[PDB]
Structure 1
Amino acid sequence: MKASRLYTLVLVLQPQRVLLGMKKRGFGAGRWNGFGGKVQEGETIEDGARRELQEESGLTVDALHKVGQIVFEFVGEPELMDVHVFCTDSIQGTPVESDEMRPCWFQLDQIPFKDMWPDASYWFPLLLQKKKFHGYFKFQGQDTILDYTLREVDTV
């Protein structure tokens, strides 16, 4: 069996648009994603998600709602990524670009799937329908899915 490391992913989903962030630097730059990163010792998963949202997008929110969980496995990496996915309840500030991340709004008929992680084409439609989900994706490198599962659930 494998070990897993905890990560968060936050989607700022409004009725007609979604905020995504483009990774600006380093390996893996050039794709759009939600905001997030590793959970730190002691903080709850939700508080880690709020923290990463503020660091990467500038937005400060009091509460999130958990919508999904996605496990990622990469060929050659024994550690799994256990990603807890949240959506914002409400926002009340503007997103800010950093040297690491550029936030941008997309209309919900212009979701930039071809420039997102390949897995997002599978679970993001569920998120848009306000459904909850569990997913698993095995990748060869950054682009190729070798195996995956996706299931709508009633409780995350």
Structure 2
Amino acid sequence: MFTSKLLTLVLVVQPGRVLLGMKKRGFGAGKWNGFGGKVQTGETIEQAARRELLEESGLTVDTLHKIGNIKFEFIGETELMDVHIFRADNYEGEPAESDEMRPQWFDIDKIPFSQMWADDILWFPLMLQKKRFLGYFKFQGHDVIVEHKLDEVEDL
């Protein structure tokens, strides 16, 4: 890995359920996921996370918690993906479909992990316990994990 790209990911939760969206185009199309994107020059990471939540789901939030940082290395690439993960326990507005993503609430027992990125099932249990975490995954293509590190932490 020679260079890095910052990315964001936002999970909105309520008691017993999590808001995901079906990615309709682009990177990770066909997978359910949280909302997020890149960080423009002049934005903070949190500002960028809030922007993409609004553009993709129609929602805004007041309190937003930083919960995770996961680095992704894809075999054959020289750019690292540095993903900054946030949780909201409350929201403003009502979710609506965009050209990019279709939001849907899932009960905990219905989260569709076989139709999500392969990493998600491993850190979702930490997220649901209101924990913080650091990780690293090396992927061979989009659906095989070849190396994996993950740890609960106190601070990020």
Query: Offset of 1:112 from its aligned partner?
Result: 1.1
Alignment of structure 1 residues 11-90 onto 2, 5 Å: 11-26=11-26, 28-90=28-90
Query: Offset of 1:28 from its aligned partner?
Result: 3.1
- Residue 110 (structure 1) aligns with: 110
Aligned length: 156
Q: Which amino acid aligns with 1:24?
A: K
Question: CA RMSD, aligned part only?
Answer: 1.2
Any unmatched runs of 5+ in structure 1?
A: none
Query: Offset of 1:63 from its aligned partner?
Result: 3.3
Q: Which amino acid aligns with 2:67?
A: V
Instruction: Call closer, same or farther: CA 1:28–1:68 in 2, change over 3 Å.
Output: closer
State whether residues 50 and 63 of structure 1, in contact with CA within 8 Å, keep that contact through their aligned partners in structure 2: no
Q: Matches of 1:27 and 1:62 in 2, distance apart?
A: 28
- Residue 5 (structure 1) aligns with: 5
Q: Matches of 2:83 and 2:5 in 1, distance apart?
A: 8
Q: Matches of 2:27 and 2:84 in 1, distance apart?
A: 22
Any unmatched runs of 5+ in structure 2?
A: none
Q: Which amino acid aligns with 2:50?
A: R
Q: Which amino acid aligns with 2:96?
A: V
Query: Offset of 1:68 from its aligned partner?
Result: 0.5
- Residue 135 (structure 1) aligns with: 135
State whether residues 139 and 146 of structure 2, in contact with CA within 8 Å, keep that contact through their aligned partners in structure 1: yes
State whether residues 20 and 32 of structure 1, in contact with CA within 8 Å, keep that contact through their aligned partners in structure 2: yes
TM-score normalised to structure 2 length: 0.95
